Ligand binder design. Structure first.
Ligand SMILES: CCNC1=N[C@@H]2[C@@H](O)[C@H](O)[C@@H](CO)O[C@@H]2S1
Ligand SMILES: CCNC1=N[C@@H]2[C@@H](O)[C@H](O)[C@@H](CO)O[C@@H]2S1
Lengths: 444, 443
């Protein structure tokens, strides 16, 4: 009984119903099993958590939940009341009960209460009834859990949800100690690893948290999340999680990129990772092999919607389709939060070398520069080629989700190329807007 | 009479959907503008697959869209962009273009355009035997298409050399433009973006200069509020840097605004205020921004009752977006060559704070502490603005702006945090690989 799949848990434009239903189809195809509904900015999930769904909204959520059932995917409805719930007010607890029972009437059997990303200070009234913030959360989570009939899946997201958020540390946290003692054993707890966006989730870090919350956690993995940096996108493989974690966890739910169609690799490789050690206890997964397996499959989606010129006539612009090597390049340029893929790292390293040795144009090492320059111009050329062929693909829906990222990298790479050519001889200047001018003044 | 003023959907990336286009027509009418130019770079049958006829499904949507334009008294101009691919000398290829344009004509469209922007200047062998230059080639098919369609009242041509800096060797001596102005039939209008692609100013003398070589007044395709070229940028400042004296020297101004549809309230509203002011001293950009923002504000409380006690947790969602929030947001996402006053002021204060920061380690310590606290308050107003936007009832507007407002709030919080650090790990490597290449360019 392992919860593996996807949480729609990010800030910004949520996914629409058509996209969520298409997620369920992909999760089933790849032998995953769970979806957690938690879009930070879907209004009736968090900001207006008190408000019941309209008849129109009710119909859409019913339809969505029946679609999950049809694709053998567990639907878990989360609610986020912590910005403004008065925990001690039984009217307020009733309002929360009312909302979750409305969703229960749509056919949903699994639920979650989330208390992430709220400040830890209670109102006067709650400080008279509860001795700490943790007691307050645990009290209503426990009451809600039993009101719903102790459902087989019920998740709790702590305020201290990762190593670095734990005061003073994970193993001595008064907040976590109270959760692990008082939260009913049937309830699962969400955790993101040592950090919000964890480079690695070591097994010993999970032993440490497990003994204080007194269960194995479900991981809410933010490895492929991109709601925090407007320029970033993550198409690298699931990585930095040993397959030995699987027996030490209740699940992994990935919180992937905002742009729905960018999550093919993110979700596909997660499925490859889970499947590789589905039945372990106490070298099964290769990230690089999994990326390749995912990109080969993704490629087939690009040629699917969602005159022959003479010897001396202008040839078709549109003739060349996207190739596996284009997607390999794109993925290496938009790889992972703490690492670029091999080609990106290599281009970056070559450009730094070229620039730092550029004064040698002005005798032996000139042929080193010219040859390295030309090899670098070719690589920039492949980035423009990749953009050009993407731009011409039949799957417009995929193109539109990626577009502004692919344009950006192509655009910058063309400008870098142009600069290396300029080294070999000797309109949009405030790049990044106001935000960018403040960044340039910070340390790096 | 007969000045084309309105909006061109002419940008790179996700086009607008039909629901948004129809809502544009309603806004253009409200504000007394009159024209829409359909030219979305990446709508596949506009440019890349310009040869392909619309499907039955696609045809029905365009018919519906064109009827909606007619209902809102907006002229619908269909553009097509064949220049990536077209063999100009091949009459099969000319016929294919004719076929597509008469398909659109059958949807009820009476106005058209051929665009040759952003294509390389080199012809194929076969075209170089028939035409002596690139301009002759374009002008030949534009002329043939124009007369096949019965010399329609509105027909636009977009030149390859569409701005001062694109003209070889300069605007007044260009062999490309000379040929256009001589040979392009007089009934045809020509598009122009000013001295540059994104022009800070469009001076009157620059328009006299281009007018005498193309031998007409141009229609301006204005990119002042375009944002398809920098993913961090958004433009909510007012229409600015074009004298009202241009209006009698032009056939029109079509603005090519931000990709995010709901961000173009100010862009289009102030353009309308500018055109109306000298339709036949008159226009203040700052006054127009204010007029536009006060109208936009009313949209935020419209979709597209617990009362907490004295000592209970107050509602998070209680405070609505204010005019002063939108004034701040606009100044943070103002214009391509200028930030609005508040942004410039915050930037200037932060630079001063950082450059004098060694004074915490006697007289001008109180200058720093006082200036620091005044700066922390301003960063606080940015977070307030984000927070209230995040709670607004018009979710459609929120989602278009979201990632920009999150970004500025996020950076401003980090700057604040840094000023506090000057007194008493997950997203430091900001901007990915693109950003690391930028940091190495000269700036
Ligand atoms: C335990 C889950 N709580 C969290 N809340 C946030 C999510 O909404 C974001 O998408 C994620 C990445 O930016 O960062 C934190 S992780
Ligand atoms: C009127 C000449 N054509 C032009 N083609 C491009 C447009 O598609 C872009 O939106 C604009 C701003 O990036 O830059 C040029 S202007």
């Amino acid at each position: 009984r392992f919860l593996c799949g996807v949480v729609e848990g990010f800030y910004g434009r949520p996914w629409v119903m058509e996209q969520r239903k298409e997620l369920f189809r992909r999760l089933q195809k790849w032998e995953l099993n769970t979806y957690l509904y938690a879009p930070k900015d879907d209004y009736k999930h968090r900001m207006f958590w008190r408000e019941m769904y309209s008849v129109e909204e009710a119909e859409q959520l019913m339809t969505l939940i029946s679609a999950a059932r049809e694709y053998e995917i567990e639907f878990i409805y989360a609610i986020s009341p912590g910005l403004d719930i008065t925990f001690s007010n039984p009217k307020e607890v009733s309002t929360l009960k009312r909302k979750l029972d409305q969703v229960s009437q749509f056919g949903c059997r699994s639920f979650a209460l989330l208390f992430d990303d709220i400040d830890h200070n209670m109102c006067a009234a709650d400080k008279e009834v509860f001795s700490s913030f943790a007691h307050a959360q645990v009290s209503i989570t426990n009451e809600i859990y039993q009101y719903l009939g102790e459902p087989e899946t019920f998740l709790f997201c702590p305020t201290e949800y990762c190593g670095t958020f734990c005061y003073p540390n994970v193993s001595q946290s008064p907040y976590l100690r109270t959760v692990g003692e008082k939260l009913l054993p049937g309830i699962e707890v969400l955790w993101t690893g040592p950090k919000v966006v964890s480079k690695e989730i070591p097994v010993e870090s999970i032993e440490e948290v497990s003994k204080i919350i007194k269960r194995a956690p479900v991981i809410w993995d933010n490895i492929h999340a991109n709601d925090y940096d407007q320029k970033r996108l993550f198409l690298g493989p699931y990585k930095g999680r040993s397959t030995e974690l699987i027996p030490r966890l209740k699940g992994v739910l990935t919180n992937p990129n905002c742009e729905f169609e960018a999550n093919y690799v993110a979700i596909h490789t997660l499925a490859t990772w889970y499947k590789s050690n589905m039945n372990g206890v106490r070298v099964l997964y290769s990230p690089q092999m999994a990326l390749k397996l995912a990109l080969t499959e993704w490629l087939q989606e690009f040629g699917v919607p969602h005159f022959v010129p003479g010897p001396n006539e202008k040839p078709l612009y549109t003739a060349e389709p996207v190739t596996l090597e284009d997607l390999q390049l794109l993925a290496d340029l938009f790889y992972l939060p703490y690492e670029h893929g091999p080609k990106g790292a290599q281009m970056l390293r070559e450009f730094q070398w070229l620039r730092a040795n550029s004064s040698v144009v002005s005798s032996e090492k000139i042929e080193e520069w010219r040859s390295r320059a030309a090899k670098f111009e070719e690589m920039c050329g492949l980035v423009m080629g990749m953009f050009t062929r993407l731009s011409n693909c039949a799957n417009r829906t995929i193109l539109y989700d990626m577009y502004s990222y692919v344009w950006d990298i192509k655009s910058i790479m063309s400008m870098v190329k142009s600069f290396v050519q300029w080294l070999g001889c000797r309109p949009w200047a405030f790049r990044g807007g106001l935000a960018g001018e403040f960044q340039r003044l910070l340390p790096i």
